[PDB]
């Protein structure tokens, strides 16, 4: 159960999966920005699905098509993360060292 994505505005989301914390960025392309979608629950679900596919293919990112979007996922180094510490209660969470950017078109 994730909070809604702020479609069609870009956002940064921190996600906890297993023992790691992941940094995700969502960006929307020219076309998908000009036209807007009214029922965002479907869109939020497609974006969660897209995040889950990226997490399921961390070592082999590839573009894919959802019902409404083409998603081009990319990783880049998560800079200035070495001086940060994440906890879930007493549990130490490890930041995944790459930012994932989903270029939604």
């Amino acid at each position: 159960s994730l909070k809604p994505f702020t479609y069609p505005f870009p956002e940064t989301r921190f996600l906890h999966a297993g023992p790691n914390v992941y940094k995700f960025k969502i960006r929307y392309g020219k076309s998908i920005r000009g036209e807007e979608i009214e029922n965002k629950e479907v869109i939020t679900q497609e974006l969660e699905d897209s995040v889950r596919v990226v997490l399921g293919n961390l070592d082999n990112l590839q573009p894919f098509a959802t019902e409404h979007f083409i998603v081009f996922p990319y990783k880049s180094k998560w800079e200035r993360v070495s001086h940060l510490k994440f906890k879930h209660g007493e549990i130490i969470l490890i930041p995944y060292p790459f930012v994932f950017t989903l270029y939604v078109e």
């Binding site: 996600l15 889950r52 399921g56 894919f64 994440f86 879930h88």
Partner: peptide, 30 residues
Amino acid sequence: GYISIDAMKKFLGELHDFIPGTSGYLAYHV
């Protein structure tokens, strides 16, 4: 033509928003 999301492997486990100050999450610097 791009591959359908429905053909791809998917992480199906628990997935949560990491929000410090809620659900026991905390973050800080040195």
